[PDB]
């Protein structure tokens, strides 16, 4: 296999470069003999599938398994050779098809034998030996090329759908290699620029197959609906974009100039990708390939890292995303999760999300209802991507984790403000966030969550809320002797924490404990510490904060 | 020198042991051909036991080597040192070496020596702690030699985990009436 | 302080709410590098601390868990501070070459068990920048070639 790959690459280099005397023709005609005899070989020449079952128990099965992998690689190298001779001969394409049919026979035999035991060997998902240069060439030729001198002879290769999914699998494996290592396996997998150039060319090809030919042309079979070529090309897209951001961050502009700053380029591409997602969604499919939707939001998430939070295209992105969040239902937890993830990540790097957190909690409280079974609330108006099976297990964890991040940021602010002693507007913004978060928790505590990680995480975040209030009143204990008095906005906050939050905290602790270890004691420890430090402050502030308490 | 160095391209993988025997027999015979022989023997296939025997066999002969090779021989001993024989071999070396006998001629060759050591000990930690245990464990004889100061200084200059360790050791030594002016 | 630097900056950049409030204060990373520009003249006394520092950043926050943001980025940025310092120094303090170089190689050769990817990356930039400046400190490489027999293959090739 690997020897032959070297020979035919050497020989291609010898054709293209060395000639522009009586030696290379030896090897040519050797190769041509190997072609014609490897064609008319079949499986009892190599005593395969029948006499040895390639078994990972015996030595002879191991011999035949090693032999089969050698054969598969030989097939592929002679594919490359027969392609490399001529300008699109019919006969050579017949040879290539015969070789691939041999290879594909061996692959579906080995797959049965990796279907009896587990897929613990990474030896049938081992590399192809085909150059990435080659496959880029091959895929441009297969899909985009419509030159009539080559069309008649390529139309036999087009008819092999199996061949095309093999080809895109090969290209995906090269991409996966480049991600996992610094580089891919075969020849010119060590000059990054050549690898970059072949990526770009591939990207154009896979866009064309994605964009030109839709996915709703499925006339293959109902096993091929997770195996569409229009899906495989998009998988590469995702992996390409990640790989080139990861390794080739200083060439993204010259990467998009293959398909004015990065923003406008990327915005028009997004427009095409998000239109693809819109038309996918707007089809109104009841089967609903969530796979295709997931890859579209994944690629949009990968690309959206290159929109500046000050750009109008950023705001177009955000408005578009919020619109999909306000419109499109799409009943699959991971779909909703990925979209919400993108929206929040984008949103908060433009402004605080606590309005959006508040509206999502309003939806949760609407849909679920209350602990007391006598509060009729429905706020389904706020966000369409909120269901009975979605928002209760899944959305709660994300909105609470985001709220935890907010509390970390105000903790950092409070720590920095304690260490400092620009004073007043800082604390005004802090209490704005904390008030709206406090109404957010007031809506959440009323709801009935499932008994998994969700309830303990709600109790843990409310412990973090009381810890942040404790740090707040500690800084107020530091400052209230120097200044003399408390700002009026803090007095409203402590009234709202006394009246709204803490009673319903106790009610929710009783509600979680009645239905049939450390966190609920930690919450009641946190609330009593909150009350203690509030006693200290109400004494050392000359303001009565227990008339606001009950 | 030429034909010897040409031995491993010549031989297959069978007739190694007899060559080993004969070469070690030549090595006790002639001191001139340590270096190229030791090179050869790192390239052929031998029993570890044989290596260790030839090691003790060269090192007994360690005073008996002209300076120029002395570098490369210690080079060998301390690339070839295992983790476990460390303190014996160091003790033997520490005994057998002098920094007194040799002495433009003496100093350049000695300097190369200390370079070779610096390398060995830079690039392998266990020599250092083992080395000091092998002076510290020889607290007994008031009579300890030039090497031992030179080597503590050096290790202080290099790996710095040992500095406290060197200092306590160097104090215990001075108070003990070993270590002195002359 | 430098870990601390990077935690602060990371938190800000992930978060616009803090960016509205806080004035962009220079970060310890940037200040050190400015020391490093100013170092050129007469600061023989400063440079011997830099080196100690940079090899402490790399040695402590070299990668380990493959042989995430929190265990990765303020180590990555720590380590990658390291390299920036020591490259920048190696441009201008021509007497702490063979003391960077010889210490890189000293952590190259023998370990081969701890991941040293970052160190060869450093070494590539270092040499590339002026290899003519390692023909003023050359013996230290050629005495590290004598350990090439004992080294894993990626190490050696790379």
UniProtKB/Swiss-Prot annotation, chain B:
Comment on protein domains: The C-terminal 24 residues of isoform 2 are required for its function.
Subcellular location as annotated: Nucleus
Chain residue ranges for the region called Interaction with BRCA2: 40-126
Disease connection: Fanconi anemia complementation group D2: A disorder affecting all bone marrow elements and resulting in anemia, leukopenia and thrombopenia. It is associated with cardiac, renal and limb malformations, dermal pigmentary changes, and a predisposition to the development of malignancies. At the cellular level it is associated with hypersensitivity to DNA-damaging agents, chromosomal instability (increased chromosome breakage) and defective DNA repair.
Recorded family membership: Belongs to the Fanconi anemia protein FANCD2 family.
Record's protein name: Fanconi anemia group D2 protein
Residues the record lists as Phosphoserine modifications: 14
Annotated organism of origin: Homo sapiens (Human)
Reported effect, residue 14 to A: Reduces phosphorylation by ATM. No effect on ubiquitination, foci formation or DNA repair ability, but impairs S-phase checkpoint activation
Function: Required for maintenance of chromosomal stability. Promotes accurate and efficient pairing of homologs during meiosis. Involved in the repair of DNA double-strand breaks, both by homologous recombination and single-strand annealing. The FANCI-FANCD2 complex binds and scans double-stranded DNA (dsDNA) for DNA damage; this complex stalls at DNA junctions between double-stranded DNA and single-stranded DNA. May participate in S phase and G2 phase checkpoint activation upon DNA damage.
Tissue expression: Highly expressed in germinal center cells of the spleen, tonsil, and reactive lymph nodes, and in the proliferating basal layer of squamous epithelium of tonsil, esophagus, oropharynx, larynx and cervix. Expressed in cytotrophoblastic cells of the placenta and exocrine cells of the pancreas (at protein level). Highly expressed in testis, where expression is restricted to maturing spermatocytes.
Shown part of the complete sequence: 209 to 415 of 1451
């Amino acid at each position: 296999d690997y020897l032959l790959c070297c020979i035919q690459h050497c020989l291609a280099w010898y054709k293209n470069t060395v000639i522009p005397e009586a030696f290379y023709e030896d090897l040519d005609d050797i190769l041509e003999s190997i072609t014609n005899r490897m064609i008319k070989s079949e499986l009892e020449d190599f005593e395969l599938d029948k006499s040895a079952d390639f078994s990972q128990s015996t030595s002879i099965g191991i011999k035949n398994n090693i032999s089969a992998f050698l054969v598969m690689g030989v097939c592929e190298v002679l594919i490359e050779y027969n392609f490399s001779i001529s300008s699109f001969s019919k006969n050579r394409f017949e040879d290539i098809l015969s070789l691939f049919m041999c290879y594909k026979k061996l692959s579906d035999i080995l797959n049965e034998k990796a279907g009896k035991a587990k897929t613990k060997m990474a030896n049938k998902t081992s590399d192809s030996l085909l150059s990435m240069k080659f496959v880029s060439s091959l895929l441009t030729a297969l899909f985009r090329d419509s030159i009539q001198s080559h069309q008649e002879s390529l139309s036999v290769l087009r008819s092999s759908n199996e061949f095309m999914r093999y080809a895109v699998n090969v290209a995906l494996q090269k991409v996966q290699q480049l991600k996992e290592t610094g580089h891919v396996s075969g020849p010119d997998g060590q000059n990054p620029e050549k690898i970059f150039q072949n990526l770009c060319d591939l990207t154009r090809v896979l866009l064309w197959r994605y964009t030109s030919i839709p996915t709703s042309v499925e006339e293959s079979g109902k096993k091929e609906k997770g195996k569409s070529i229009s899906l495989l090309c998009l998988e590469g897209l995702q992996k390409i974009f990640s790989a080139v951001q990861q390794f080739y961050q200083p060439k993204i502009q010259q990467f998009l100039r293959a398909l004015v700053s990065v923003t406008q380029r990327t915005a028009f591409q997004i427009r095409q990708f998000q239109r693809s997602l819109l038309n996918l969604l707007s089809s109104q499919e009841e089967d609903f390939n969530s796979k295709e939707a997931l890859l579209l939001v994944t690629v949009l998430t990968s690309l959206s890292k290159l929109l500046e939070p000050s750009s109008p295209q950023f705001v177009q992105m955000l408005s578009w995303t919020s619109k999909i969040c306000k419109e499109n239902s799409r009943e699959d937890a991971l779909f909703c999760k990925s979209l919400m993830n993108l929206l929040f990540s984008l949103h908060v790097s433009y402004k605080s999300p606590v309005i959006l957190l508040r509206d999502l909690s309003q939806d949760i409280h609407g849909h679920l209802g209350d602990i007391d079974q006598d509060v009729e609330v429905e706020k389904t108006n706020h966000f369409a991507i909120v269901n009975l099976r979605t928002a209760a297990p899944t959305v709660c964890l994300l909105v609470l984790s985001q709220a935890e991040k907010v509390l970390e940021e105000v903790d950092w602010l409070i720590t920095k403000l304690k260490g400092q002693v620009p004073n007043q507007p800082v604390e005004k913004a802090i209490i704005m966030q904390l008030g709206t978060l406090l109404t957010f928790f007031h809506e959440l505590v009323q709801t009935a969550l499932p008994s998994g990680s969700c309830v303990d995480t709600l109790l843990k975040d409310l412990c973090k809320m009381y810890t942040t209030l404790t740090a707040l009143v500690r800084y107020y204990l530091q400052v209230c002797q120097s200044s003399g008095g408390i700002p009026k906005n803090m007095e409203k906050l402590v009234k709202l924490s006394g009246s709204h939050l803490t009673p319903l905290c106790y009610s929710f602790i009783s509600y979680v404990q009645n239905k049939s270890t450390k966190p609920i004691p930690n919450l009641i420890f946190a609330i009593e510490q909150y009350e203690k430090f509030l006693i200290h402050l109400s004494k050392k502030s000359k303001v009565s904060l227990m008339q606001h308490m009950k | 020198h030429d034909i010897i160095t040409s031995l491993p391209e010549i031989l297959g993988d069978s007739q190694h042991a007899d060559v080993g025997k004969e070469l070690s027999d030549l090595l006790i015979e002639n001191t001139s051909l340590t270096v190229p022989i030791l090179d050869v023997l790192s390239s052929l296939r031998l029993d570890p036991n044989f290596l260790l025997k030839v090691r003790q066999l060269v090192m007994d002969k360690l005073s008996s080597i002209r300076l120029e090779d002395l570098p490369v021989i210690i080079k060998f001993i301390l690339h070839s040192v295992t983790a476990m024989d460390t303190l014996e071999v160091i003790s033997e070396l520490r005994e057998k070496l002098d920094l007194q006998h040799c002495v433009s001629s003496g100093q350049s060759c000695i300097i190369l020596l200390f370079d070779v050591i610096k390398s060995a000990i830079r690039y392998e930690k266990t020599i250092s702690e083992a080395w000091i245990k092998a002076i510290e464990n020889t607290a007994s004889v008031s009579e300890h030699k030039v090497f031992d100061l030179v080597m503590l200084f050096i290790i202080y200059s290099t790996n710095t985990q040992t500095k406290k360790y060197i200092d306590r050791v160097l104090r215990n030594k001075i108070r003990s009436g070993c270590i002195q002016e002359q | 302080s430098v870990v601390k630097s990077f935690k602060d900056l990371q938190l800000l950049q992930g978060s616009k709410f803090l960016q509205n409030l806080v004035p962009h204060r220079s970060y310890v990373s940037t200040m050190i590098l400015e020391v490093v520009k100013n170092s050129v003249h007469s600061w023989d006394h400063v440079t011997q601390g830099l080196v100690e520092l940079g090899f402490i950043l790399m040695d402590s926050y070299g990668p380990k868990k493959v042989l995430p943001s929190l265990s990765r980025m303020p180590n990555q940025h720590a380590c990658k501070l390291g390299a920036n310092i020591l490259l920048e120094t190696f441009k201008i303090h021509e007497m702490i070459r063979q003391e960077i170089l010889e210490q890189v190689l000293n952590r190259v050769v023998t370990r081969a068990s701890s991941p040293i990817s970052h160190f060869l990356d450093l070494l590539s930039n270092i040499v590339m920048y002026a290899p003519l400046v390692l023909q003023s400190c050359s013996s230290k490489v050629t005495e590290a070639f004598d350990y090439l027999s004992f080294l894993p293959l990626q190490t050696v090739q790379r």
